[PDB]
RNA sequence: GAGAGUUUGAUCCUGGCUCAGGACGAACGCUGGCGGCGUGCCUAAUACAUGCAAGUCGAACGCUUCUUAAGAGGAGUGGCGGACGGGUGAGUAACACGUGGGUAACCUACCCAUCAGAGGGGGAUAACACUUGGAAACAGGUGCUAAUACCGCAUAACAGUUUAUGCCGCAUGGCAUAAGAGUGAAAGGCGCUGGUGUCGCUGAUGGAUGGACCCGCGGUGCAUUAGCUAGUUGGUGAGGUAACGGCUCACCAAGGCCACGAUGCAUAGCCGACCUGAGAGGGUGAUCGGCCACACUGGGACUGAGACACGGCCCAGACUCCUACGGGAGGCAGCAGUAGGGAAUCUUCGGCAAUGGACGAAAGUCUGACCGAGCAACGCCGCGUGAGUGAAGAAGGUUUUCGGAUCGUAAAACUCUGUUGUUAGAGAAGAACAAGGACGUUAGUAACUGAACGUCCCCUGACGGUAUCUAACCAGAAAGCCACGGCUAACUACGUGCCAGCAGCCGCGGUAAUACGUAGGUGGCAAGCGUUGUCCGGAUUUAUUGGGCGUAAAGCGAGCGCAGGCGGUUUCUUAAGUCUGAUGUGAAAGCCCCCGGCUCAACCGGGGAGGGUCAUUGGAAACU
């Protein structure tokens, strides 16, 4: 399945994360199709970068986030406006 | 030459090759075939020990080694230094270089790695021969 | 090996039938292409018949849709 | 690695006070060894080259791969002098920067009392000597370690400071005021030498 | 875009050899404190002992065992996944790869959006009970039984096809509408109160996603390899595939490829990229990513949306293993690990906490992917191995012109410190969650559960009581390697006497060796140093950039001429070359520039730039 997801990076003992556009068939890291934004937790809280009008444009195209995304998408207000719209 | 020319053969570079032939091949016993690999150092067998002359502006008496390889080439070393444990069918490690002595030898022999002792009372310069500390 | 022994099992089952059921529609075809070579007027059933084999086989995953169609559409033009 | 090694044998191959303060060439001045006060024949351009290089490095305690990737990173600059840049890159490296402010005798006492930790940039603990220093920063010693009578002795003995630098002694806080200069530093070096020897 | 040494009695040319630098998946030797980050069978795609790597669903189905009708466990059937992930690079000189395009010759489970529909019936089967099979895996026989398993019956074609029009395209043709003829679908579970919501079920479209095919151009050596092909080349039919077509068969014809290198032989995965270089270029294709190919060797299919399938089936072959000797079983180029080969390159470790994937309504189960840890100085980076004062200068080593000189402020001594180390305490982030307990909003509702969305409560760490921070203490436990005739920075003494030995090149050694060996001393590097091997450069030493042929290497012994290469002036024309605007793409990572975080640095992350003898369109045309 078409997947909204995040790709690992950084050094061991200090990750870093790509969110991603990635088939459920590709490698954890590898085929991509798009970046729509990028994420840490290594802040004190959670520290995050976003591409709303690309990330909302694969979920209308059909896109199905995991779970840590959604929550993300939810603090940044995607997963609303995707609502909103098909509402 | 005409670019014509050039065309019609290009330019063909002066073909280069190596200082030491023998530790640029291996073998592999199923398919009995020499095997192009690039390897620093070698293991051979000394099927002989002996003593040689050297070149005109040169007087000495040269020890050198002749070895079976590992990859079936017989090969003629030289054995630095002073001394040495080695006889017929002595395990020994080879390394590149020639002797500008002999010409035939483009090979020496290793010491502190096998059979071959490290050299005695060597005190400086003494990675080369490998012989361990004096405390 | 590894939960891969119900697979072979379910597998030449699906064989079974599924060989069976292609048999099934082949011989309702060639039946259908001796009637139109000995011109009898059972022609009309058995055009049906065949039509009927080509598109249940296309259903239940033996047939392609394409290679149905053209299947019907050869059985077309050998009636018309 | 680090030179534990005499001073002053150093500082007379070269001929040359690094320290500034003479006893290291006074009654000697003459390169190490049984041959050394006895007549040295020619020496080469090679030579030349190479000991204006061992001058900088043995100042500053560096190695050579260190002081080979500060010279690259000189190189990559181009808004001046290749050599003076490279220079400047030297004083902007802790060991120098406790010299200059007077918070230390010797460039070795400052890179342990730097590497021992008693000093502070902007009020965080630096145990790395080679620590580069932009314009502006302010180095600390560590309010803790103000005790010591050695650093004490060392600051309330200091000659009149460089130029390019700002310091108080009862805060124990300075820094610098400029890039720094050229000409305030040891001019007695021929950067262009060190240029061409990395050249090659 | 730095050169140096070396032919000679000496000189200049020519010409080669070697050195000065950078880089290894490196190895050997000597030595060896720590931390961080990364890398680690290049050889035998050699053989595999052992263990673990793909399972999941009881909210699809019927049994069985334990629960006082509850939940939990065993084997069933069924579905989904097993085709991804992971490994390797043998084969492959070709649409395999890269790039640019095309498919009016195509396919696509899962995910989205839409139009619809989901009716009524049937016959079995495992499991289970007995039976024989006897070591028992196996296997067969009789009987009973459920399903979202299977069968066919009912309706729709919105699918496809043909006709009639219209429209358009690049011919074949494609799009919209209408009509005609014939055909086909299904499944229910959970919950609420017949109506239902949710998850699933069937048909059609569209999108996304990935896949399949086709074309231009490009990238390796030999002509001591000049001919090659016969379903080969094309056509008319037919068959066949998801689809085009010799993909296949018949029939008709004899064509087709090539000196612009076909065919054959050898070699090789290709690429982004990596090393070097002034660049042009060269060399490589390890780690990371992409495409391809392979799974003991060869072949073939089934299942399935998807394979002609690493951990699936059948057969042949090789190779091995267990047998009660009747018969079975297997395939590490998955992670560790063994043997062997080798110059040589890892623990038969922990956890799914994270991230990702399968399944499932969900918890959750699985996951040698992955997170981590471990070994290796294999590499890059960083800090150490104390610091200040301390003399015309302790002793001792070496040397001496016997006065002294040097090891040497080095030491001893006194003052200070605790990076580090030892000890004791404190002790992060990485964690976001999901589900669950609560509320609230939307559009669906006859109405509530319920779905989507938001806000609180709740709980989750292998690493690890590690990082890290604090305090007590000891200078105390922590430096070696190579070279020293010149090229090349660095000099004396003794022994040896063309012997021992050195040696990258020139060359040293034959009783006074700065070249051997030792001692002292110095120089270059430094937890590394040196050496071999490989690549580049210097090497303009294959010269496009960028060389030459009177004597150094080289003008064929000379001519006639096919092919090709080149070609007088000039009008008009074109626009293949050329020049040029715009648009697209050239993935990410990497190089480079600006930023920012790791006590700095390596490293990590963000943003940008650039990269194509690249492609479409649009102009000029001076020159060919
Ligand atoms: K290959
Ligand atoms: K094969
Ligand atoms: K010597
Ligand atoms: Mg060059
Ligand atoms: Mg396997
Ligand atoms: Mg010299
Ligand atoms: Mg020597
Ligand atoms: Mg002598
Ligand atoms: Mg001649
Ligand atoms: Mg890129």
Request: with cysteine.
């Amino acid at each position: 399945a078409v997947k909204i997801r995040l790709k690992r990076m950084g050094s061991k003992k200090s990750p870093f994360y790509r969110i991603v556009v990635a088939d459920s068939r590709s490698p954890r890291d590898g085929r991509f199709i798009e970046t729509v934004g990028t994420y840490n937790p290594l802040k004190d809280p959670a520290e995050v970068v976003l591409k709303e009008d690309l990330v909302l444009d694969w979920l209308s195209k059909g896109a199905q986030p995991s779970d840590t995304v959604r929550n993300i998408l939810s603090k940044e207000g995607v997963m609303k406006k995707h609502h909103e719209a098909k509402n | 030459p005409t670019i014509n020319q050039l065309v019609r053969k290009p330019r063909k570079s002066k073909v280069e090759k190596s200082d030491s032939p023998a530790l640029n091949k291996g073998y592999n016993s199923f398919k009995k075939t020499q095997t192009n690999v690039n390897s620093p150092q070698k293991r051979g067998v000394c099927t002989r020990v002996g003593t040689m002359t050297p070149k005109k502006p040169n007087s000495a008496l040269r020890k050198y080694a002749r070895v079976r390889l590992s990859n079936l080439i017989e090969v003629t070393a030289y054995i630095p230094g002073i001394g040495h444990n080695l006889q017929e069918h002595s395990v020994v490690l080879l390394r590149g270089g020639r002797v500008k002595d002999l010409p035939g030898v483009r090979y020496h022999i290793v010491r502190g790695a096998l059979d071959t002792a490290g050299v005695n009372d060597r005190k400086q310069s003494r990675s080369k021969y490998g012989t361990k500390r004096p405390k | 090996i590894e939960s891969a022994i119900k697979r072979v099992r379910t597998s030449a089952n699906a064989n079974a039938k599924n060989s069976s059921q292609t048999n099934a529609m082949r011989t309702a075809i060639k039946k259908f292409e001796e009637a139109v070579a000995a011109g009898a007027d059972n022609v009309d059933a058995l055009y049906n018949e065949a039509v009927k084999a080509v598109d249940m086989a296309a259903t239940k995953g033996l047939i392609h849709k394409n290679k149905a169609n053209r299947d019907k559409i050869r059985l077309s033009k050998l009636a018309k | 690695s680090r030179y534990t090694g005499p001073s002053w044998k150093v500082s007379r191959r070269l001929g040359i006070s690094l320290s500034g303060t003479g006893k290291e060439l006074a009654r000697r001045p003459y390169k190490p060894g049984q041959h050394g006060p006895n007549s040295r024949g020619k020496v080469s351009e090679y030579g030349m080259q190479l000991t204006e290089k061992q001058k900088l490095r043995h100042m500053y305690g560096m190695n050579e791969r260190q002081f080979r990737t500060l010279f690259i990173k000189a190189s990559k600059i181009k808004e001046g002098k290749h050599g003076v840049n490279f220079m400047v890159l030297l004083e902007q490296r802790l060991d120098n920067v406790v010299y200059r402010l007077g918070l230390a005798t010797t460039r070795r006492q400052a890179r342990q009392l730097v590497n021992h930790g008693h000093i502070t940039v902007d009020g965080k603990r630096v145990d790395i000597p080679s620590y580069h220093v932009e314009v502006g920063q302010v180095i600390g010693v560590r309010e803790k370690s103000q005790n010591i009578s050695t650093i004490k002795e060392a600051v309330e003995a200091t000659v009149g400071r460089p130029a390019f630098v700002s310091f108080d002694t009862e805060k124990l806080e300075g820094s610098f005021t400029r890039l720094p200069e050229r000409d305030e530093l040891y001019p007695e070096i021929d950067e262009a030498l060190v240029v061409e020897y990395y050249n090659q």
